[PDB]
Amino acid sequence: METVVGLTAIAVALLIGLGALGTAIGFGLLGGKFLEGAARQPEMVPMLQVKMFIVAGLLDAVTMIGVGIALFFTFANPFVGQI
Amino acid sequence: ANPEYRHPFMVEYIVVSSDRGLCGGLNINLFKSLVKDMSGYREQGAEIDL
């Protein structure tokens, strides 16, 4: 029993840690270009914010799936019942 | 295409004359026309560089 429960804590750490690593770097890359565009054309900032939010939805999509499967493995673990 | 920068020349006298004789009023008609604008700048109270 102890192995499954112990290896489910490592699974949760990887699902949230790998997601956090990618999301942080992805917004550093996307946001950096949003500041470059806003400085060049300060009158287009209202349009650039909505376009950045469209991309933000795509960037975090799989990260949000992983963080929902990690809070499911934490509360009412699906693999404990299988054994 | 580059509204990011405005050169000072895009936001708010050199006089040409001859070196020799036989000019049929060429230089006189030019100075006569210049004095009208220099006088106008002094009605406005502005200093003039030539």
Residue of B nearest to A38 (CA): B4
Residue of B nearest to A37 (CA): B4
Question: What's the resolution in A?
Answer: 2.8
DSSP of A24-47, one letter per residue? HHHHHHHHHHHHHHHHH-TTSHHH
Do the Cβ atoms of A21 and A75 come closer than 8 Å?
no
Out of A16, A27, A59, A60, pick the active-site residue: A60
Rounded Cα–Cα distance for residues A74 and A39 (Å)? 44
For the CA atoms of chain A, what is the radius of gyration? Answer: 19
Rounded Cα–Cα distance for residues B44 and B19 (Å)? 33
Looking at residue B4, what DSSP letter applies? Answer: T
Look up residue A59 and give its two tokens: 């960037």
Look up residue B22 and give its two tokens: 């036989």
Residue found under tokens 């003039």:
B48
A16 is catalytic: no
- Per-residue three-class SS string for chain A: CHHHHHHHHHHHHHHHHHHHHHHHHHHHHHHHHHHHHHHHCCCCHHHHHHHHHHHHHHHHHHHHHHHHHHHHHHCCCHHHHHC
Rounded Cα–Cα distance for residues B48 and B26 (Å)? 23
